[PDB]
């Protein structure tokens, strides 16, 4: 008794007290303001609800035995909100239930009472007018069964609850699709519900039916409106296709909503990562660099761990495919050094023109590269090693025998050396010529690049950039000023005094 | 007081990075710790170094000595409030700050120093506080502390001449500059051989002369190496007692490239294990070698690589590989032909080199300014 | 010793003499101005980020 008579009940009351101002007070504030008069895009409760969900991810971790936090769902389900005195009475009844839980034991909904949470929306004299509130309460109740899924084959209950929530969402899409107030307040809620359903399906289900449902929902959208709903669904569909090995490029290249121009810097990173991955896997490297750099630079700055790992790894791999990447880890993190050491060896072998080191590292870390899902994009790189070796040996020498070329590239055959050199010459890699009868290669030397036109272009690009940035800055200039109607010149009644003084001076 | 403490740091390093060097310094460092009733070094030294399982008695007795001294100083404070001079409590806590800094850890010393900085109305005492802060920063390698204290000291020394304090600050600033990879300013600031080296705290004069010649070989060129480091009377008088360094300088200057390599190898061995040169001891070497290569080819036009074999160091293949790997880097502008083993020279214009630097600085500044631009406005 | 810039040829013992243009003084000022601008941009962080 002494062990839990002061610390265990406190854990129940402290989490309950926190949930009093976390969901009950926050729910009341949203009902009176966000769900009351009106709620704009920057709703004080929508961001608050998102932050509350993110915090609740690390606020409650146990199954909430003895209704420490599980009875909060029973407490939030015992709400009427039908009339102002009726809402006060419902709040008082919830307070009485909390007092009883302080005195007696409430329902211990810890892996044993999740089923009885289905008729609650139809009970306790609930008010169904606030459809977004019901959707949010269902997503939060789904999260309580989806916070950790309780493992041990308990994802079936979460899937059933998600199916019920999806049926409710389909009803909301059916009930006033014009959204008098159906979607205008639940669009973010609908996106979050779709994301949670996709997460549950990826956890313990199949995504084929989820993909069909998402495609149908997206088709239903993009006709009434084309904002805030055409991005998360598209990202989920792209992720579902990325799980398999489909084309994944026909759908992305026909949709005009990939650039909604309003993503809150959230879906843009995922869209850019998917587009860059597809472009790199589609034998195109020039275009994907800008997109993936934008993706990396649009990522959240604080505590995004797993995400910038894979994207930065792919960025350095594809930049090696292009052939220049010195700086990659100048922002070392405690979970960043371990996951990037093997690729270091790769680039260290890649930078030199030798190819034996390429095999020496590949035959060692092939399994690790396969486990990271980049083996198919890492075996097509030996040509770049040969190219950089030829370029280096052309820069260094001017008149060199082909046998030495073969020896210093260890191509194992001098006959293929002339073919490789010719192929390099043909695409404009080098400007040298070889004499078959003699054998040596006579490099062509021509230097005077300042007289060439190209510096002009190399400056034009940056000049245009610097001219654009200023304009953007001045375009974001006068947004914060507002309500400056105050316009007073000198005074109100001083004109009469001045006129009187002038008349007095004139009279004298 | 931090007048004798600097050497301790070196010994610490001599046990950390050198893998096999763990037998000599382990006894005299522990002797310096058992003296002065130290407690600061071995909160973590015992963890990093040997376990020293038989230690509890020394720990307890040193702790008890620490509380004895602290209690005596506090009772002096208490006696001092009732009849104060220049608020004699504040001079008393200034006296306690040295002991707390020497025996205790950083935070207590910093708090005591920041508390006692508000007493002194004389400028010299404030300068002494700043010098203690700078010495602590050098001891524990705190970049922000060093920068802030250096700028504060430079601002404060403007009032009143105090040319001695200026020379001391110049020596401190030179040590900080040579700590990072900045040799130009280090060799510039090390022109105090004749303007006094009274800062015997950090090191002795002979080490100062060796450091200044080592950095003068990097920073400056022949028309100044012939005017300041080879003509100085005092530096030559000191160097006369050091045959190795004099040989190492004359070999480079008199164009005896054969004997240059032995001195270069010995010097780099010496500075690999040396403090504040180890983390980049390689880079220094990678200059001198290539520097010598650039000091021979600029007179002739078609020198063969055969001559370099007996004139610069044996091994034609070694010279070939070094020349190739330095050509590929973009510096040491020349060319080599291997079918007949002939080295040719060229003279690129000083406008190409003065253009990629502009473009790369512009790129870096553009990246930084774009990051700054989109940090704000969410 | 840089008091006379030319080149020497050992094959025929021939002293080739050539002149070079003076170094352009426009660039280095721009380089150090760019460095000063970098310092200013660095200083703007403490004014901007400390409340955002």
């Amino acid at each position: 008794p002494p062990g839990g008579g002061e610390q265990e009940p406190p854990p129940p009351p402290a989490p309950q007290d926190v949930e009093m101002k976390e969901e009950a007070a926050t729910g009341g504030g949203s009902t009176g303001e966000a769900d009351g008069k009106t709620a704009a895009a920057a709703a004080e409760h929508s961001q608050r609800e998102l932050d509350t969900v993110t915090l609740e991810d690390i606020k409650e971790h146990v199954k909430q035995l003895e209704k420490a936090v599980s009875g909060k769902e029973p407490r939030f389900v015992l709400r009427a909100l039908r009339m102002l005195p009726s809402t006060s009475r419902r709040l008082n009844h919830y307070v009485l239930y909390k007092a009883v839980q302080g005195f007696f034991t409430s329902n211990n909904a810890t892996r044993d009472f999740l089923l009885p949470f289905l008729e609650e929306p139809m009970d306790t004299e609930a008010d169904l007018q606030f459809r977004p509130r019901t959707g949010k309460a269902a997503s939060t109740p789904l999260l309580p069964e989806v916070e950790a899924y309780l493992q041990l084959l308990v994802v079936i209950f979460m899937m059933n609850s998600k199916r019920y929530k999806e049926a409710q969402k389909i009803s909301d899409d059916l009930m006033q699709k014009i959204s008098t107030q159906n979607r205008r307040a639940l669009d973010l809620v609908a996106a979050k519900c779709y994301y949670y359903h996709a997460r549950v399906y990826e956890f313990l289900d199949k995504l084929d039916v989820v993909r069909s449902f998402l495609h149908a929902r997206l088709r239903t959208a993009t006709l009434r409106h084309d904002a805030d709903g055409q991005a998360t669904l598209l990202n989920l569909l792209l992720r579902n296709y990325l799980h398999y090995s489909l084309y994944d490029q026909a759908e992305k290249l026909v949709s005009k909503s990939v650039f909604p121009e309003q993503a809150n810097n959230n879906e843009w990173a995922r869209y850019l990562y998917y587009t860059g991955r597809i472009k790199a896997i589609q034998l195109e490297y020039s275009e994907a660099r800008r997109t993936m750099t934008n993706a990396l630079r649009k990522a959240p700055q604080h505590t995004a761990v797993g995400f910038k790992q894979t994207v930065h790894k792919l960025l350095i791999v594809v930049e090696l495919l292009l052939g220049e990447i010195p700086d990659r880890l100048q922002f070392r993190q405690p979970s960043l050094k371990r996951s990037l050491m093997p690729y270091f060896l790769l680039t260290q072998a890649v930078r030199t023109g030798n190819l034996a080191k390429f095999n020496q590292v590949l035959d060692q870390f092939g399994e690790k590269f396969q486990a990271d899902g980049t083996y198919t994009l890492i075996i097509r790189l030996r040509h770049n090693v040969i190219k950089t070796g030829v370029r280096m040996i052309s820069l260094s020498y001017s008149r060199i025998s082909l046998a030495d070329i073969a020896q210093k590239l260890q191509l194992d055959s001098p006959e293929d050396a002339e073919f490789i050199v010719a192929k390099a010459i043909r695409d404009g890699v080098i400007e040298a010529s070889i004499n078959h009868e003699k054998g040596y290669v006579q490099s062509k030397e021509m230097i005077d690049i300042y007289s060439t036109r190209e510096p002009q272009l190399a400056f034009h690009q940056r000049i245009s950039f610097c001219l654009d940035i200023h304009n953007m800055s001045v375009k974001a200039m006068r947004f914060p000023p507002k309500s400056y109607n105050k316009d007073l010149e000198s005074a109100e009644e001083r004109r009469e005094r001045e006129q009187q003084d002038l008349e007095f001076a004139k009279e004298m | 007081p931090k007048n004798p403490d600097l050497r301790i740091a070196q010994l610490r390093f001599l046990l950390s990075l050198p893998e096999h060097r763990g037998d000599a310094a382990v006894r005299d460092e522990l002797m310096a710790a058992v003296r002065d009733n130290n407690m600061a070094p071995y909160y973590e030294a015992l963890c990093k170094s040997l376990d020293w399982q038989i230690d509890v008695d020394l720990l307890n007795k040193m702790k008890k000595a620490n509380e004895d001294e602290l209690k005596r100083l506090d009772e002096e404070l208490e006696d001092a409030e009732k009849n104060l001079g220049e608020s004699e409590i504040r001079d008393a806590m200034m006296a306690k700050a040295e002991y707390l800094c020497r025996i205790g850890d950083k935070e207590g010393a910093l708090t005591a120093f920041r508390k006692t900085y508000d007493k002194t109305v004389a400028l010299g005492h404030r300068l002494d506080i700043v010098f203690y802060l700078l010495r602590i920063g050098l001891f524990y390698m705190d970049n922000d502390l060093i920068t802030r204290n250096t700028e504060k000291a430079k601002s404060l020394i403007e009032e009143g001449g105090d040319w001695d304090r200026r020379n001391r600050l110049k020596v401190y600033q030179g040590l900080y500059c040579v700590a990072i990879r900045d040799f130009k300013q280090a060799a510039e600031l090390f022109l105090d051989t004749v303007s006094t080296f009274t800062s015997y705290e950090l090191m002795d004069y002979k080490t100062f002369v060796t450091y200044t010649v080592y950095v003068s070989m990097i920073a400056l060129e022949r028309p100044d190496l012939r005017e300041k480091v080879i003509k100085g009377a005092e530096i030559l008088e000191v160097l006369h007692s050091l045959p190795a360094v004099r040989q190492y300088l004359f070999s480079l200057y008199e164009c005896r490239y054969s004997v240059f390599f032995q001195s270069l190898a010995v010097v780099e061995q010496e500075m690999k294990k040396d403090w504040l040169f180890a983390p980049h001891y390689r880079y220094y070497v990678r200059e001198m070698r290539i520097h010598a290569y650039s000091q021979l080819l600029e007179s002739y036009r078609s020198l063969t690589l055969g001559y370099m074999a007996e004139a610069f160091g044996v091994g034609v293949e070694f010279i070939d590989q070094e020349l190739s790997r330095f050509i590929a880097a973009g510096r040491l502008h020349c060319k080599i032909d291997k079918v007949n083993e002939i080295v040719e020279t060229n003279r690129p214009d000083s406008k190409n080199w003065q253009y990629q630097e502009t473009i790369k600085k512009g790129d870096l500044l553009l990246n930084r300014v774009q990051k700054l631009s989109r940090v704000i406005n969410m | 010793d840089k008091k006379f810039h030319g080149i020497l040829d050992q094959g025929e013992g021939v002293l080739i003499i050539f002149d070079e243009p003076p170094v352009d003084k426009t660039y280095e000022a721009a380089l150090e101005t760019i460095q000063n601008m970098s310092k200013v941009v660095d200083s703007l962080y403490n004014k901007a980020k400390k409340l955002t």
């Binding site: 940056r462 200023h470 800055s473 200039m477 914060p480 000023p481 | 553009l366 300014v369 | 601008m37 200013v40």
Partner: peptide, 30 residues
């Protein structure tokens, strides 16, 4: 090129100044 860079820096400084000076005006109304 250099002049454009300077103009961009000045524009960023002006934006920072305006935003900082104006964000501290809503709370004075209570």
């Amino acid at each position: 090129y250099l002049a454009s860079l300077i103009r961009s820096v000045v524009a960023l400084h002006n934006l920072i100044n305006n935003k900082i000076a104006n964000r501290d005006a809503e709370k004075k109304e209570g």
